[PDB]
Design a binder for these strands. Structure first.
Lengths: 201, 203
DNA sequence: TATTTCCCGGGAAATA
DNA sequence: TATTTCCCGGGAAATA
């Protein structure tokens, strides 16, 4: 038995997220408030270190979330015969892909250090000179926008669509609107066009 | 160029490269390809600060395969690269990461479904994908081996191979595969070329 | 391994 | 090199 952070636990990832009745949870939380915690939750380790995935006791975990405890008693499971092999597969599938700005910084360094042409770099990476150029352009964008690219909140084309505005204040404005209204790039491109007619008036 | 045999014990991973994670099965799969035909693409290394010790530049995967095969020696190409060159070679490789082919993913999905007795829905949930995306990959496993190789060798795209499935006859599919390559057909054309061949099945 | 339809961002050709 | 244009396969919603 181990006490683990309530924030570290996530529901069973293969199953759909369960939705419990507030009354049934309150009814369970009142059973914990009276008699205490009686059965610890069962979890395992995720790909990340500080993070656990719930196997059993999702109901009890939710009860202690509402009771606002920082810690929850838990039983860790150390499975290998299948788990470790499958975790290797799922990780080999969900390979961590570098963001536009990450690549842009990588391209910038490679061009500075080894005095390469964009053509030369594009050749090596099996890409078009224009693809390299349009990534490097993103480096001129405001740091808030660059973070949104990294945090994968927006796509490359989203950030590219902001470049024409040229004014950092106008860009960070739309960035928040893109996220809040979940705008696609086609919408984002139009939203820019319309703001460059408000620049005329 | 020049190939030389060096001690497996003398080689260390690329400093600037992040600590790689390889599947024991994928390594064993490579080691068994070396054990059978007795041929390896030689690793690229350089000399360290110490003598008789080499630092790996490329081919960490192949080096690991020969470690498990328990050979004392590994064919290698020495390069006089500076800490900057070595670091940039690590970057360019970290950029041009080998992305898994449709068939590779299909085989991965099939195993994951066999192992954990999961639904396609369940797997799709875990991988953050749509049930249909999982289904349509697994479908490719029914295609002729020539077509499956073309996917792997990246001669055609997933959607190309998917478009062949309706031509339920393996002979008709391998026919179009060659036509897709020869005429450099996109998927839209390949879909039409199939429709037209299912009116030649009527005639 | 169920299949069809089709929207949309990657990314490169065209262009400056 | 930097910028504009826009085609097309990934991949998921819909599934006469």
């Amino acid at each position: 038995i181990l006490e683990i952070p309530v924030n570290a636990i996530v529901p069973n990832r293969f199953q759909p997220r369960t939705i419990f009745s507030d009354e049934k949870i309150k009814e369970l939380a009142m059973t914990i408030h009276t008699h205490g915690i009686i059965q610890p939750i069962v979890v395992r380790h995720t790909e990340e270190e500080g993070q656990y995935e719930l196997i059993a006791g999702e109901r009890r975990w939710r009860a202690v979330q509402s009771l606002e405890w920082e810690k929850i008693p838990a039983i860790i499971k150390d499975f290998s015969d299948t788990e470790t092999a499958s975790v290797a597969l799922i990780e080999n599938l969900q390979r961590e892909e570098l963001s536009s700005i990450e690549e842009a910084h990588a391209y910038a360094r490679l061009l500075e250090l080894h005095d390469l042409t964009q053509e030369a770099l594009a050749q090596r990476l099996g890409k078009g000179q224009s693809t390299i150029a349009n990534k490097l352009r993103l480096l001129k964008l405001p740091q808030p926008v660059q973070e949104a690219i990294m945090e994968k909140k927006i796509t490359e084309r989203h950030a590219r669509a902001l470049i024409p505005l040229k004014q950092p204040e106008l860009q960070v404005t739309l960035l928040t609107e893109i996220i809040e209204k979940s705008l696609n790039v086609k919408q984002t491109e139009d939203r820019v066009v319309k703001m460059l007619e408000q620049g005329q008036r």
